[PDB]
Amino acid sequence: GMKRLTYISKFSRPLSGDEIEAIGRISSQKNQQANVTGVLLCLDGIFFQILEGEAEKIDRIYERILADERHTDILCLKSEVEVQERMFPDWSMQTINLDENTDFLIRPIKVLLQTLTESHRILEKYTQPSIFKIISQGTNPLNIRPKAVEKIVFFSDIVSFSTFAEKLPVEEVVSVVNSYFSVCTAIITRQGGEVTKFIGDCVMAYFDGDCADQAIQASLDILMELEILRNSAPEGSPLRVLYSGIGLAKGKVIEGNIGSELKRDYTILGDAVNVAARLEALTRQLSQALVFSSEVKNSATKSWNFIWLTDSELKGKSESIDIYSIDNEMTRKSSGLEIARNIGHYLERV
Template sequence: MERGNQTSIMLSLMATVIVALGLFTDIGFTANRFVSDILVKQVATKRMPPNNILIIDIDEYSLKQMESIAGKWPWPRSIHAHLIEGLSELKPEAIVFDVLFSEHDIYRPDSDAYFSDVVAQNSNVYLAGVEVSSNSMLTPIKLKDYQQALSLEKNNDTSTQALSSLVLPWIVKREHWRVGSINFSTERDGVGRHYDVYRNLNGWHWLSLPAKVASSLNYSLPNSSSIKLNFIGNELIPFASKRYVDVFQILEASKDSSAYHHLKQQIENKIIIVGSTASGLYDSRVTPISHHYPAVSILATATENLMNQSYFTSVNIWAEILALCLVVLLFTASSLAIKNFRNVFFIIWPAWFVISLLLLLTSYFLALNDYLFSVGYLILSSFITVVTVSMFRGIREYQQRKKLLTIFSRFIDPRLVRELIDEQSLELSTRSKSCRVTVLFSDIRGFTTLSESRSAEQVVTLLNGYFSKQVATIFKYGGTLDKFIGDAVMAFWGAPVEDELQSENALKAAIEMTENLIEFRQSLPDDLQDFDVGIGLHTGEAVVGMIGSEQRYDYTAIGDTVNLASRVEGLTKNKARILLTESCKNSCRSTFNWIPMGSFSVKGRSEPVNVYSIKGMLIQTEQ
């Protein structure tokens, strides 16, 4: 396995593990809840309120209008007793108070007694209780003593000495209690999303008020300790509702009125929930629907959810983890595996957008069917993964591009290097490969004599001027400059980029190099007119790659093909400026004026080598 692939796999696995662990952190919680809350709010707008729940609202208007009858809040309990008596005649299925009746009215004890008697006479009246912190000023009660009154359930591990601090409807006789808890717990971000089915009181299970009502009406309860609320609508009171004062006045008026008969139609066989939305009573909570959502609407929502089993069921956490790992692993691996960095933006980012959209749509349609699939962290983590991997790929590719440009610009035309890098056709690899190449060797004739009659500085200046022209020609025809060997130049075609016309391009470069020689020689003094060149060409298999040590390596070709090209260049002396082997000649697709130069024995070859030259106006051979 290649090192790059190993790195990609390791990074993919590391990213997957880190992201999976992040699901259980505050980041995972916040992301999931953010998206889930949006979905819950959207799904709520699609749900219609049930026709069997009616809220009697103690609102600001009712508080104001009831002052002449009941005075300031809290009202005498006899007011609520009158309400129960009047409603009972209209035959509701249940009357539920989201109001606490815990403190005795020391100034109106008869009013409390009246309320207690009315509750005792009506078995469909349900009252609220609350568990408070053990640090409160309340005296804890022994739960065993209230097992029957509160319908507490215990298990084998429940302690008979367990205590709890509870706010209960003490003004009503204990034997007539039908009490459930109305505690509404928030999550770590301060938002309430669940409602108790039962409350665990130090091992004793106490049904919540909605669960108490649903159970009493023979609805089955879920096995879980709480449900995730599936809200209805986007209004603060999404259920049918009437003002407390309006209901009270109708019940106190004539029973023959049309208003009374209309009220009877609204009350009969309905679950009546009495609660407050008045801002002065501060009975609101933070929910996904609103930061000031009336507690009475929450209680009604929980009651509806339990009766219709419409509460949200969360998708198994392991399914979420599996989906998270698969998506992150997919994006990480594919982002690292894609060769072209631009494809990260043209493929991975559109893919992320589409998959994220599909996840949201899937989550939305599941939510419409009462299943909650948390995809917020999944989308966020995949986004962070793609961003991180994109940056990693960008930095790595920039470094690789810079390295490639630095290395290959010495051997290939820098403009071609940039194009090849952009096309991902040029890759840096320390592994050599065998391929077909055409090798060119060019040597200066008479260089030894020249160097003996000139200073070192003059020789270097002369060579630099000559080599500049020749290298430009090699680059022009797509050749790769291998090395300078004293006064000789080695180049080859066919690597690192494949070239179907490699032999022909090499020969054209050789022809132009001889033309460069003639032009360059015209600028030299008379004593350097013997300055000449010999060029040898051969096409065959060679090993090409980055060869050298860790401290220094070059892109070069080695093998018998290179050796033979060098030997052919040595045969040019006193014969021709250009000589090429038969394999090079046969590989040329264009027709040149070939001149057979005979067969020659060369070092390292048991059989003679046939060589050829070409003739033309600009090519002068020496007989």
């Protein structure tokens, strides 16, 4: 089957018109040998490209394009499969430098192209990268049919977050929560999970149902990085009292086109509110930064140093489930209200 990809990217360093022209001419030479066609346009440090050809050949080229150091922030806008005919059959690669174009009608089109692209980049920061993953795979996220899938669900939150808001100027609270969300998001993504939303100071994330080992490793890595962050912050920095609790459970999530037609999403976990609230109660109650359910513990395959802590209920059922953690130096902590009082005393004096 024929495939056609459309993407936009950004110059990761200044490029001259001659340098853009050579990319186009060399792209033409290579695509001709691959029986691939398309068009490359540049405008004010933005690349736009459409590539079409045999799916296997398209992916090889796009893999190479992704790796090219000369541009960054590569976003696939559209991925067509089973394409019946080419849009650009005589263009192995046609290059159109819009900066140099001065045609009468193209001038307002350039302004609109630029504006649509900048707008699109704004929106990209405010949507989940999993919708773009669906898009890069050749499927409209609005067309996903409903599916029940078991996931590992990750909930973390900030210990005594209300103390920050009460004791610090608002710009500094934002700075702390951003440092927290950044640490969590980078590690979860590194470990193959995906952040689905922030609920206040709570980070909610999914791992595949068979990836409990990765969810546990992500949790430990987050705790390790927050300890390093606390230790290494400037004197008097609020980050010195940034602590997290983390809870893991398994949940039956539903994938689909979900929402209000006004607002949509790709996933729903029923009673996420209550699982998060119950996990937060356990991390506070147990003086344990990481807690997870029996289902998570027994889905893991690696030889984690598991420790049984208590029974709780997470789902609002009457089923009493075993709560576990990892026993290592990091999780071997003493208290509770002492943590709360410590944070407030410290933040009062900075």
